[PDB]
Each structure stands twice: as C-alpha cells, then as structure tokens.
Design a protein around this nucleic acid. Structure first.
Ligand code: MG
Ligand code: MG
Ligand code: MG
Ligand code: MG
Ligand code: MG
Ligand code: MG
Ligand code: MG
Ligand code: MG
Ligand code: MG
Ligand code: MG
Ligand code: MG
Ligand code: MG
Ligand code: MG
Ligand code: MG
Ligand code: MG
Ligand code: MG
Ligand code: MG
Ligand code: MG
Ligand code: MG
Ligand code: MG
Ligand code: MG
Ligand code: MG
Ligand code: MG
Ligand code: MG
Ligand code: MG
Ligand code: MG
Ligand code: MG
Ligand code: MG
Ligand code: MG
Ligand code: MG
Ligand code: MG
Ligand code: MG
Ligand code: MG
Ligand code: MG
Ligand code: MG
Ligand code: MG
Ligand code: MG
Ligand code: MG
Ligand code: MG
Ligand code: MG
Ligand code: MG
Ligand code: MG
Ligand code: MG
Ligand code: MG
Ligand code: MG
Ligand code: MG
Ligand code: MG
Ligand code: MG
Ligand code: MG
Ligand code: MG
Ligand code: MG
Ligand code: MG
Ligand code: MG
Ligand code: MG
Ligand code: MG
Ligand code: MG
Ligand code: MG
Ligand code: MG
Ligand code: MG
Ligand code: MG
Ligand code: MG
Lengths: 98, 170, 136, 48, 96
RNA sequence: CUAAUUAGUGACGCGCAUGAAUGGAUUAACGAGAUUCCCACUGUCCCUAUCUACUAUCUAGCGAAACCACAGCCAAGGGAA
RNA sequence: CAGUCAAGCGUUCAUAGCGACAUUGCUUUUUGAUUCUUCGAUGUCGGCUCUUCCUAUCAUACCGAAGCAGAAUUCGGUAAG
RNA sequence: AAUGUUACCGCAAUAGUAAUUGAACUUAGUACGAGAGGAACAGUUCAUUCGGAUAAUUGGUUUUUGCGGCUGUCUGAUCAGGCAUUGCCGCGAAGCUACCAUCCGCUGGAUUAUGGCUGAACGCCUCUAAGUCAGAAUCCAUGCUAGAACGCGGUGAUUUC
RNA sequence: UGUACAACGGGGUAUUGUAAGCAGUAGAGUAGCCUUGUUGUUACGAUCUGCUGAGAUUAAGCCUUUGUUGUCUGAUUUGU
RNA sequence: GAAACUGCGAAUGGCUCAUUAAAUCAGUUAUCGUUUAUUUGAUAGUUCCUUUACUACAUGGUAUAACUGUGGUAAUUCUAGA
C-alpha cells in the first residue's frame, strides 16, 4: 500500500481515493478529488492557487522550524596508517616533535 | 531489503538482510543524509545512529542525492556528477535515476555509522582495515606527522615491505 | 475478445458503443477505426454493443490508405476515455480512444504502437505487448 | 452505522490478482452485547 | 486501535473523522462485513448464521486487513487522524 | 456513396404511356417548398439520473358537467356463431 | 403440417437418411367460399411499450439412431424451465 | 368498524418464487486416425443475460442560492446590498442516483425420456406382466416475499368518583 | 424532574480560497506647493504584499457537548 | 611497465550526389570588415603595502582516478556506498 500525492494540490491520496489521468505523452497525473482535477483541466497554475502545496512552498508559508538548526554530527580520530607498511612501526614514528 | 553498512572509522564494511517490513519501515519517507536510530531496525543495533548514504533499487538504478521523490526519473547528466561517467569531452547523457527518498522498491539501502551503539557488530567494530596509501607530497607528510618544516621529510616517508622469493624488499 | 486471446479479462466499464470512432494507434496506414461490432458481446433489446479496453471489435477505416478502406477488419482497443476501475481500487482514464488493426488470431497488422497502452490489453494480447512502449 | 473502505492482500490461486492488494467496500454494524430475558419452547403439531 | 492493523499499527478506532455521518461514534463491539447490507443507517438489523456450509474457495479464504479507512465521510476526507492533519497542515490561527 | 442502401447521385434507353407557349431544354439569384449526403452540434439513442416553479395531494370557503334500462368478481357451456 | 403401402434413391443394401404411383389425416398467423352478428358507429396498416399464452423446439439439460473412427453433422425421445 | 380492552412475541393455510448462457487455463496436441486433423468429464479463473440491494469509493445532479468571481443598473462615496421569471461563470458538501459505481443470488428429494436388475407369461427368450436400480434446464420441498383484514398460539398489564 | 428534552453558545467535521480594517521602500504612472531637491514634500493610482490556509458557511435528514436560558398533567375513549 | 590521471588527436581521411537555377561553381577581386590550434621568428627587471618590529620563496592548499573493500540489476563501454 502506497499513499500517493496529487500532482496539482500536493494532497496525500489514500487507496481508492480520487482519480488517475494518463496524458497523451504518457505522463501520469493523479488528483485527490474532482476539485484539483477540474482546476487542472482549466490550465490553472498551482503556484497561483493559494491553498496548494506548490503555492505555499513558493510563497514560503509557515515552513518555520524546518529552516531552524538541527544537531547531526560525529567524531572519529583513529588510525590505521598504511597498508603493507607494517603499521606496528607507524604509531612509533607518529609521536612527532611538536 | 539488504542493508550495506560502513564504519568509516575502521574502514569496515559488512551487509545485512532485514525482512519483517516493520523493521525496514523506519527508513521509509526518509531522504539521504537523515540520521536513523538503530533500535527500531533491530536489537543488534541499539543506540547505533545510521546515516542514509544512498542505494540501488530493483533493476539496479542508483539513488541520487537531491532529487527528492520516492521514484525514478530520467535526467540529463553532465560531467562531475553522480551516476554518470562521460565517455567523451562535453558528452552529456540522459539516464534513468532513482530518487533520494527511501521506499520498498529498493534492493539495497547504503548506510554509514555515525555513533556506535551499546553492542559490537560482527564484522564492523571487531575488525579494522588499514589505509592503503600514505602521504606523498612533501607538506602532506609534514602534516600527517606534524613536522614543522625542519625535520627533513626524507626519513618520515612510509616504506612498504615486499618479498621476492627469498629476497625481502622495501 | 474471444479467439487468440491468452488469458481472461476482468470486467471494465464499457466506453465505446457501436458507431464510435477511435484513433488508429499503429503504423499500418490507417488514421482511424469505426466500430461496427464487439466480439463476445451479448444481447438485450435496444442495447448497443460497446467495447472496452482490451476487447476485439470489428471495424472499418474511415480515414487512411485506400487499400485499408471500404472493408471490415478486426481491431483491438488499446485506450479508453471513459473512466474505469481496477481491483487495486483506482479509477483511471486515457486522453483518447485508440485501437490497432489485427487479424482474428490477435496478431497485429502494423509494426509499432504509438502512445501508451493499457496493461489489461497488453496482458490479453501478446503481440500488442511486444510492439508497445509505455504501458499504463 | 455505515460503510468504509479496506485494503488487503488477496489469496486466490489462479487469479490475476493473487497475492496482489485489492481495495474493497465494507459495512459496519454496531453490536453491543445482547441481554437474555426469557425462553420459549415450541412443540411440533400437524398444524405446524 | 479498533481500526488499526498488524500493518497499520496507529492507535485509532473505526470511527471516521467527524464520526459516522447520520449515526454516531461506535463505542461498542461491531461486525465488519464485506460489501453492503440491506436496510439503512440507524436501522435495527439481524445477522444470522449461514443455512449451509460453503466450500466455494471464496468462502474459507482467511482474510487479513492491511488498512481500514478512517477518513471523514462528510466531505472528501484528506486525513486519517487529527494527528495526521496537524502533521500535514502545520499550525493554525487558533491552536496553541 | 456505405460494413451493409426498395434511399441519393452519374450513366444507359424499342420510353407500359417523354417531348416542344397542352410550351421543350437550359438557368445565376431567391424559398418557413419535396429529397440525399457531409462538418459542427447535441439526452434522439445506448440508459437513465437529478434540480426549480406551478399542479396534483390534505384543509376553509365556493362549487359545475358528461353520462345513467337495471347494474357491476370470474372459467367454461350454450346462445343473434 | 403429419401419416400408411413400399416401386425406387442411397457403390452393395427398400425403410441410416430419403421416397414415386396411390391413399388416410391434422391445422385455422394463407387465400378463398358464406353473409350469422354490428350501418341512431366495436376508430385503419406498421411501429414503439408491456404482459401472458401455444409448441409443429432455433439455443440451452439428459437421452436413443446413424452410411457415428476422431472432430463436425444428421434423425429421433423427455422437454416451453 | 366489529368478534372484552390494550401490548409484546410468534405459528403458517393459501398464494407468489429465479436465475441464465459463454469463454479461457488445465485435462491435451491426449483419446481416435495412414495422415490431415482432433474432443470430454473432475479442477481453476473470468464473462453474458436477468434479479435484489446498497452509496465506502468514482461519476452525474445544485435554491446549501455555501464560498469565490463577472456584466448592467440602483442605494452620494466606502462598507454592505437590491433588481435582471434562480442574471451569468468556477468550485461546491448533504441527499438522491449509475453495469457510469460496489456488494449478494441456497440444496435436499421425488420423477420423464432412456439405459438396466430379478423374472414369468411362452420348460427357451425377454427392462415388465408382479416386484425393482440408475436417471433431465422437469416436479415437490429447502430457501425467499406476503400473511387469511371472518385461520391460529404463547405472553404482559388490565381503569372505581 | 433525568447519560431528560429544547433554543442558543462551544469544540470537531466539511465547503470556499485568503474577510473587513490598517499598513507598506510593491505599482505602468499622475498631478499640486515651494525652500526647485544631492530618496524634496503633501497627497492620489488598476493592482500587489503583510497581519491571513484568512473570513464566511456548516444540519435544515453531519458529529459532539460538565456552558447559558427555558420546558415538563391539555383533550377523548375503552370491560370478559 | 598494466591500470588510471594529465596533454594532444578524433573538425583530417574515406563515401555519396539527395537538395541546390543568381545558389553553388569558374576566372577575377576586397578585408581601411574579421577570427585563426599549430609551425616558424620575435617579445616580459615593475605582481606585496600608509612602505621598521612583516607577507610561506629553501617553494603555500585539498580533492580525486587507478587501487582496496562492501554492493545493486535479466540485461550495455550502467554504476552506488565506504
Ligand atoms: Mg462530485
Ligand atoms: Mg463535476
Ligand atoms: Mg429498437
Ligand atoms: Mg516487433
Ligand atoms: Mg455519509
Ligand atoms: Mg460522504
Ligand atoms: Mg439505389
Ligand atoms: Mg440514409
Ligand atoms: Mg438518375
Ligand atoms: Mg424513359
Ligand atoms: Mg412491358
Ligand atoms: Mg408547336
Ligand atoms: Mg404533356
Ligand atoms: Mg440561361
Ligand atoms: Mg429551400
Ligand atoms: Mg387529480
Ligand atoms: Mg391538514
Ligand atoms: Mg375542499
Ligand atoms: Mg366553473
Ligand atoms: Mg366470463
Ligand atoms: Mg361446463
Ligand atoms: Mg408400390
Ligand atoms: Mg442397408
Ligand atoms: Mg437398389
Ligand atoms: Mg400459413
Ligand atoms: Mg346479415
Ligand atoms: Mg362479414
Ligand atoms: Mg356498421
Ligand atoms: Mg351501435
Ligand atoms: Mg363508440
Ligand atoms: Mg373499444
Ligand atoms: Mg452400411
Ligand atoms: Mg430417448
Ligand atoms: Mg415459460
Ligand atoms: Mg361490548
Ligand atoms: Mg496445449
Ligand atoms: Mg481412416
Ligand atoms: Mg435471461
Ligand atoms: Mg454570489
Ligand atoms: Mg462594477
Ligand atoms: Mg478603502
Ligand atoms: Mg425598483
Ligand atoms: Mg422584466
Ligand atoms: Mg454528491
Ligand atoms: Mg445490476
Ligand atoms: Mg418430495
Ligand atoms: Mg437379464
Ligand atoms: Mg423402465
Ligand atoms: Mg411397470
Ligand atoms: Mg406381458
Ligand atoms: Mg433450476
Ligand atoms: Mg437450504
Ligand atoms: Mg434463496
Ligand atoms: Mg391476521
Ligand atoms: Mg392472535
Ligand atoms: Mg493569506
Ligand atoms: Mg423531509
Ligand atoms: Mg460556552
Ligand atoms: Mg423551550
Ligand atoms: Mg572530408
Ligand atoms: Mg574540494
């Protein structure tokens, strides 16, 4: 079971829901309901339709903490200095001077 | 689906096969670069944080960071780009590509250890493999050993032992 | 459908009653197909036989090579406009009505099929599956 | 009460949809426990 | 988790968002029967044991639900749970 | 012309019984004139569904007509069949 | 529309399937013959709609024959669900 | 209406009655045949015609005159509205609704034709005379709809100014 | 006279597509006063943006409710 | 000295005669109307900074192939993660 997404509005489409349209060029369009489908047939442009996802993304509407900072990072600091070089003597030369 | 996991600290890699779609399901709708806590995936991995690095679906098409989508498209790939190796100068090609959002259609999820859990993984933390090659360029030798250029790099270069018959070389 | 079809088809909404004209989607030289009958269809007083995706119809060619015209031949419906429903629960539809001219066995007259094809049809007629590009 | 929709895997060897998912309509009837207040016995007669 | 599933797992009952249109919430045990039943919503109904034993192969199939639609029936329901709605819609002018 | 045409049109003519102001033939333009096909259009149809108003319907007041041998459940029989 | 006789047909073989010369019938969606009812009025052909009935059965169930190897077909029975 | 009143739960006389046809896979390139050709039963998956429901889904319907948009004019402007036989357009819940949508359509017995058993008449022989086995989209039940307003049962409570 | 019933109000559900108001360095531009501009100023301008997935509507046969206000003995008839 | 990186070549060659009728092409012109890898000949003392507590010049930076290792696809001169 996959939940699809309307190719106009950006709404989730649960199974059995809405309609599917196969265009002449074999591009597939899925609408959650007859509303988006009609708008679509009207050549309306989602970015000009206020309630759509594409419109809200473009006009940057309430994205908020998604652009806020997050914590993902790491630390390693280990050594396996060279292959065939007898690494036993590689940690001895590794104390340096400074 | 198969999990291909790497420990970048030791240079170790081992795979894993996870059935039981509920355990897999933790990765679904997750993009590349997002971390994943281990316990959900299994008990063997607990407290292990996994970075999603990529993978291939059935039919073998590779994921490409940045496309989003949980699906395949056909892009036009230039030089210096992933999932393309140009055969000729200025040669671009149009090729099928899998999205960067994880889904059930994947054959293999590639992962990278970030934080280690509370239990040792068989072929990962237990074994370590050496860096194949050492510093070549002058200052790079100096900066691997921190030499503060006085110390005459010629002594500090790495030397590899090789055996020919009863003759052992360097 | 009937003769030469490997397998069975699940019922799909009937979109093309007798008299409908659909695009001819192969390279045979025909521009369109005028449906005069549907194979395997039944009988009710006043009911028009109608074709659905995957069905075999009898047809004439209204626009096309004069050698194709003025005669009745078999053809197979590869695309519907009327919405139908699959068992995976989706209502879907194409942008046009189209079929391809074929012999009673199900073998195709032309070498290729332009445009998408419905899988219900592809599964039903092997020869159509061969010559098809994007399916569904 | 009403109806809703269901998704489930179909087990039907030989069917094109064997092992595939199908989506199906179902009704729902509200059935709180019934309570027993009595018994009637019936006897057979030539009139029924 | 009446309306939940081995596969779905999310805690929810079979009551749709906004509740069964023209009925209510279903706070007791229930029978979920495939397809449709004679009579209308709110009507008294009798369910009866079969008068024979079906082999049929269509009977005897042992079903396992993957998912039960809990979306609203009072319009075109876009959401299974108020959680899912808040998840997708973000925050609104009433809210917190 | 159509898949298919007692239709239409173009030809043919020992034409039951065409034919020259009993006017013959031709004819642009015009026609709520008869006929044929085509494009568009469409609930004419496949195959039906839904909505609005006013009716019907129930109430107050008002209040006709047609028709009427006697009347009003059938099957068969005979009988002006 | 259906029989009886059986000379013929059917490579041979009357009657698998047929069948002359003759002859006995049945039917009342043919057409005639009649003129009984209706001329102080029983609204015409066809179609559309819709119900029911008949069986001399086209299909579908189960059978018996064959000049029935199979496949196909033909003849016949119970059959109008 | 009336068989005391009123209520609940039931019986079943009689009457009605319903399901229908095809294809594919497989059997099987098998049986049969010199070859050319070439089946069926059991099993499976779909379909046709018909029927009874139902509205989760999809579609149709719009006076939800619900939200928005538009022309013309009228209220000084604004806001907010009126008028144009529902002014017009897009979307539009609810309801209704569609092989344009989904679901559901039972199994026992007795028989016909016909093939038989035992078996005389007729020392032999015969399915028939006596007796008898198997048997059809038939018929009778099962099941389904009504419930006799002059067919019936079980049960509850039964009035004082 | 009580998980009573009703009229409102609240919350959910659903439909539309961002209300009025105010503000702006958004705006083809246009005028008026001079102290004639080293953003000169006062305003005006289809439209645009912000507060604003807002505002409006939502049972008339949607769901729900610890809130408010109210309602809770009229008429007729029946017996073995 | 494999592999790979870098550089250069792959715009030459070979083939065909479809288009093309003031086009091409030919002889003759023009660049005071432009671009030109290459070959050949020439051609570069100046690079920092309010210009004493000074700038790596004895020479500054990583990030990658090949490789190692873990992989995906029926399938290609496909390629992913480490
Ligand atoms: Mg709709
Ligand atoms: Mg619509
Ligand atoms: Mg007709
Ligand atoms: Mg081919
Ligand atoms: Mg509802
Ligand atoms: Mg609804
Ligand atoms: Mg003619
Ligand atoms: Mg005509
Ligand atoms: Mg003529
Ligand atoms: Mg003539
Ligand atoms: Mg004559
Ligand atoms: Mg004269
Ligand atoms: Mg004359
Ligand atoms: Mg003239
Ligand atoms: Mg005219
Ligand atoms: Mg009337
Ligand atoms: Mg009244
Ligand atoms: Mg009155
Ligand atoms: Mg009057
Ligand atoms: Mg009578
Ligand atoms: Mg009598
Ligand atoms: Mg004779
Ligand atoms: Mg013989
Ligand atoms: Mg003879
Ligand atoms: Mg006749
Ligand atoms: Mg007379
Ligand atoms: Mg007469
Ligand atoms: Mg008369
Ligand atoms: Mg009279
Ligand atoms: Mg009269
Ligand atoms: Mg009459
Ligand atoms: Mg013989
Ligand atoms: Mg028989
Ligand atoms: Mg009948
Ligand atoms: Mg009394
Ligand atoms: Mg075979
Ligand atoms: Mg032979
Ligand atoms: Mg029928
Ligand atoms: Mg309006
Ligand atoms: Mg105006
Ligand atoms: Mg204003
Ligand atoms: Mg006025
Ligand atoms: Mg007027
Ligand atoms: Mg609706
Ligand atoms: Mg039906
Ligand atoms: Mg019986
Ligand atoms: Mg015997
Ligand atoms: Mg017998
Ligand atoms: Mg007997
Ligand atoms: Mg006898
Ligand atoms: Mg039957
Ligand atoms: Mg039964
Ligand atoms: Mg039944
Ligand atoms: Mg009664
Ligand atoms: Mg009683
Ligand atoms: Mg806004
Ligand atoms: Mg009402
Ligand atoms: Mg309150
Ligand atoms: Mg009140
Ligand atoms: Mg050349
Ligand atoms: Mg870098």
């Amino acid at each position: 079971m996959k939940v699809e997404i309307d190719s106009f509005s950006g709404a989730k489409i649960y199974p059995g829901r809405g309609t599917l349209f196969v265009r002449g060029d074999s591009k597939i369009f899925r609408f959650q309901n007859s509303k988006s489908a009609s708008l679509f047939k009207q050549r309306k442009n989602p970015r000009r339709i206020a309630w759509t996802v594409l419109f809200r993304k473009h006009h940057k509407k309430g994205i908020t903490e998604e652009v806020a900072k997050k914590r993902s990072r790491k630390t390693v600091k280990a050594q396996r200095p060279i292959t065939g070089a007898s690494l036993d003597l590689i940690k001895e030369r590794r104390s340096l001077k400074p | 689906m198969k999990l291909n996991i790497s420990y970048p600290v030791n240079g170790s890699q081992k795979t894993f096969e996870i059935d039981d779609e509920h355990r897999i399901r933790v990765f679904f709708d997750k993009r590349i670069g997002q971390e994943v806590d281990g316990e959900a995936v299994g008990d063997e991995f607990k407290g292990y944080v996994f970075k999603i690095s990529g993978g291939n679906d059935k039919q073998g098409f590779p994921m490409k960071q940045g496309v989003l989508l949980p699906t395949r498209i056909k892009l036009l790939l230039t030089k210096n780009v992933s999932c393309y190796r140009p055969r000729r100068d200025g040669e671009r090609k149009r090729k099928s590509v899998r999205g960067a959002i994880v889904g059930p259609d994947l054959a293999v999820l590639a992962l990278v250890i970030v934080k280690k859990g509370e239990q040792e993984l068989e072929g990962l933390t237990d074994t370590t493999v050496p860096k194949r090659l050492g510093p070549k360029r002058a200052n790079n030798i100096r900066k691997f050993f921190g030499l503060s250029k006085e110390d005459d790099v010629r002594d500090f270069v790495i030397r590899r032992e090789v055996t020919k018959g009863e003759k052992t070389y360097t | 459908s009937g003769n030469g079809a490997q397998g069975t088809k699940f019922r799909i909404s009937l979109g093309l009653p007798v008299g409908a004209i659909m695009n001819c989607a192969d390279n045979s030289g025909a521009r369109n197909l005028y449906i005069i009958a549907v194979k395997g269809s039944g009988s009710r007083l006043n009911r028009l036989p109608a074709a659905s995706l995957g069905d075999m119809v009898m047809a004439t060619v209204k626009k096309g090579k004069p050698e194709l015209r003025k005669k009745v031949m078999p053809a197979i419906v590869v695309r519907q406009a009327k919405s139908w429903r699959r068992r995976d629960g989706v209502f879907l539809y194409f942008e046009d009505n189209a079929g391809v001219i074929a012999n009673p066995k199900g073998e195709m007259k032309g070498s290729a099929i332009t445009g998408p094809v419905g899988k219900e049809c592809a599964d039903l007629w092997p020869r159509v599956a061969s010559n098809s590009g994007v399916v569904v | 009460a009403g109806m809703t929709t269901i998704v489930r895997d179909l087990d039907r060897p030989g069917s094109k949809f064997h092992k595939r998912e199908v989506v199906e309509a179902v009704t729902v009837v509200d059935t709180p426990p019934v309570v027993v207040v009595g018994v009637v016995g019936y006897v057979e007669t030539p009139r029924g | 988790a009446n309306g939940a599933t081995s596969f779905d797992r999310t805690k929810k009952t079979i009551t749709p968002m906004g509740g069964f249109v023209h009925y209510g919430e279903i706070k007791n045990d229930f029978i979920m029967v495939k397809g449709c039943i004679p009579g209308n919503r709110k009507r008294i109904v009798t369910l009866r044991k079969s008068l024979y034993t079906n082999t049929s192969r269509k009977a005897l199939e042992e079903v396992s639900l993957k998912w039960i639609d809990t979306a609203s029936k009072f319009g075109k329901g876009r959401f299974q749970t108020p959680a899912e709605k808040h998840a997708f819609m973000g925050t609104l002018k009433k809210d917190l």
